[PDB]
Design a protein around this ligand. Structure first.
Ligand SMILES: O=C(O)c1ccc(-c2nn(C(=O)c3c(Cl)cccc3C(F)(F)F)c3ccccc23)c(OCc2ccccc2)c1
Ligand SMILES: O=C(O)c1ccc(-c2nn(C(=O)c3c(Cl)cccc3C(F)(F)F)c3ccccc23)c(OCc2ccccc2)c1
Lengths: 262, 261
């Protein structure tokens, strides 16, 4: 339902808007993680280095709570960037306004975990626009339920990163996630699915041109949407334990609204 | 992988799918749409008459809601054996590590049962006993305590899944894809499983293009349903646990408890 040139044009549009919307790309994150440059992050691996990192790293946003609350504020910034990106997806702002809210409500976390994988390897995650690197072992060692928060994200990212996607692939994949016609409470499924159909055609052609030797990469990427859904559900149940255990811990109102009745 | 090889693989699976499963989607749709009218169970009195006249096996505690629930469990155990026989016809499956064969079936059967159950359902009810009976959605949803809300999610899934309008030749490949899932926990040799799934996916993609040329990106939409299947199977497990801990009248002969574990 779309010619090849139109699908290439749509792929280029989305990549361009992705570069404009997300300040830390996978390409930059990989150049920081693979090193070979003098761009080097400060590495936080224990309590003493955290204390030194806060002195050296210029953070834009008890140790476990401090790290948790900071993650929440980074997630809110991520929602803002994802929302800016979503408005560039052709057709999205023309949808019913309640459906725009619904698509963002259920899509933003799946996108956050997708894009978080770009900042991750098996040993830890880049933080503060790549200025810092916090080890997976240090996060797993946090007290109470906080230790178990990041480990599922690392588990996903190790598998997702084996697909070797780049930002130009990811730009379309993220659009596909937002324009999901199966979100609960949608009023007008038909125009959402028509946009997703074009996005899926564009993703399929993008993966064939950019990864010609990666057989059925399109199918394998769509199957990862299953892993994303699973970790979002785990995440929601994990916060509920914190809400009942940590009663003095505030959650950001934007995050409060997203998780409500999910 | 050439097109003729993919078509050969698609036809092999369709042929085996027909032999392994007692009621095809095509035959089920002919019964459901009214095109030997099945005996209809729509309340307690018709249930009792169905057990007396048709004598439905698996629906033979004296409480009705429990009896119907256990009957779903008993049919699902029968379905597992049909799925196991079908799996053996998938090229490459029996050549896998024997523990990996068991693991793929153990973790795949719930998703496959839900998928194939949809072939037997419409928005008003479900066929039972090889299409000889039809039990209404309202009767199942009206069962007491948690049993009623146990049945309704199955219908909600099936109504959405059936909107894709797959036929048996599509489903035969799709079921094979689910079985050859390389991400099941405890697999020892993932590589040959993903190599077989890659062939099956190529065969499903081509099958869907030739069989539904007007249904844009149906391949993508069907793979997106694997998300729904995983989600409802996880929900299913939690619902069973609540029933296991709450209900005291669910006891069977210990030998039957072992069979239908
Ligand atoms: O201030 C800052 O610039 C800043 C910046 C980042 C973090 C921080 N983010 N984060 C994430 O997962 C993450 C990331 Cl990388 C990128 C995008 C979206 C997300 C999230 F949406 F998924 F959230 C973490 C996971 C584990 C630990 C930290 C992060 C951050 O953490 C708070 C913190 C860090 C160190 C010391 C004290 C507090 C702070
Ligand atoms: O023919 C067939 O392929 C087939 C296949 C499935 C059912 C049937 N299973 N089922 C379940 O809950 C279920 C499911 Cl989805 C997946 C795994 C395990 C279970 C269960 F173990 F938990 F059971 C149902 C819930 C409601 C309605 C039907 C099912 C099935 O039901 C026939 C039936 C219906 C009512 C009374 C007696 C039999 C038939």
């Amino acid at each position: 339902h779309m010619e090849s040139a139109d699908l290439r044009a749509l792929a280029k549009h989305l990549y361009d808007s992705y570069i404009k919307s997300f300040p830390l790309t996978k390409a930059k994150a990989r150049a920081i993680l693979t090193g070979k440059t003098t761009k080097s992050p400060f590495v936080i691996y224990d309590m003493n280095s955290l204390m030194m990192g806060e002195d050296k790293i210029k953070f834009k946003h008890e140790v476990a709570i401090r790290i948790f609350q900071g993650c929440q504020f980074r997630s809110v910034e991520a929602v803002q960037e994802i929302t800016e990106y979503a408005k560039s997806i052709p057709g999205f702002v023309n949808l019913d306004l309640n459906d725009q809210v619904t698509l963002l409500k259920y899509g933003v976390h799946e996108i956050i975990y997708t894009m978080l994988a770009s900042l991750m390897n098996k040993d830890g995650v880049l933080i503060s626009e790549g200025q810092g690197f916090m080890t997976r072992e240090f996060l797993k060692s946090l007290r109470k339920p906080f230790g178990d928060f990041m480990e599922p994200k690392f588990e996903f990212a190790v598998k997702f990163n084996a697909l070797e996607l780049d930002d130009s692939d990811l730009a379309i994949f993220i659009a596909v996630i937002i324009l999901s016609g199966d979100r609960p409470g949608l009023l007008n499924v038909k125009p959402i699915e028509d946009i997703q159909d074009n996005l899926l055609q564009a993703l399929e052609l993008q993966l064939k041109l950019n990864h010609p030797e990666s057989s059925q990469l399109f199918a394998k990427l769509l199957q990862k949407m299953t892993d994303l859904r699973q970790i979002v559900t785990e995440h929601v149940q994990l916060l509920q334990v914190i809400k009942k255990t940590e009663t003095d811990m505030s959650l950001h109102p934007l995050l409060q609204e997203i998780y409500k009745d999910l």
